[PDB]
Design a binder for this molecule. Structure first.
Ligand code: HS6
Ligand code: CA
Ligand code: CA
Ligand code: CA
Ligand code: ZN
Ligand code: ZN
Length: 158
């Protein structure tokens, strides 16, 4: 399907969850982008004003697209594949409790998966893949993409 046709990609954080320290949100998102730039030719840059390729949004319930959120649990986040406008954007359900650790829902881990979608990946049937569509906490300090994730992304880029 669709991929970004350029190497320099921008992101912007639209708003911040009150669940976390601001700096921790910035760092979780930055690290999640780094996971993918590690294994592709892409470069990601945070911008503070204007139109970014990938807008990161925290919202609850109905929030202006065809993917209303469902309160605590269930759908944690969703993202749109590469394209103009809302293409690339990643939305996180504010009815979750976002964290830097094993409590609540880990923002970094969720964001790695969502950014996969923002870059054009679909879901994997392999439970070991970050793109497996079921949330399960794993240690973030030593996180690695599965072989399936790497072959998926390198089928699109590089
Ligand atoms: O992209 N959104 C989805 O696939 C919807 N499922 S999810 O929110 O439980 C979810 C989100 C992110 C994960 F890493 C795992 C599960
Ligand atoms: Ca939810
Ligand atoms: Ca966009
Ligand atoms: Ca919340
Ligand atoms: Zn949405
Ligand atoms: Zn998904």
């Amino acid at each position: 399907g669709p991929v970004w046709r350029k190497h320099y990609i921008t992101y912007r954080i639209n708003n911040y969850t009150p669940d976390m320290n601001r700096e921790d949100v910035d760092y979780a998102i930055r690290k999640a982008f780094q996971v993918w730039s590690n294994v592709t030719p892409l470069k990601f840059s945070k911008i503070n004003t204007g139109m970014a390729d990938i807008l990161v949004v925290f919202a609850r319930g109905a929030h202006g697209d065809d993917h209303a959120f469902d309160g605590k649990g269930g759908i944690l986040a969703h993202a749109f594949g590469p394209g103009s406008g809302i293409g690339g954007d990643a939305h996180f359900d504010e009815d979750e409790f976002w964290t830097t650790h094993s409590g609540g829902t880990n923002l970094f881990l969720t964001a790695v998966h969502e950014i996969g979608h923002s870059l054009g990946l679909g879901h994997s049937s392999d439970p070991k893949a970050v793109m497996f569509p079921t949330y399960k906490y794993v240690d973030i300090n030593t996180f690695r993409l599965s072989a399936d994730d790497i072959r998926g992304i390198q089928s699109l880029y590089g």
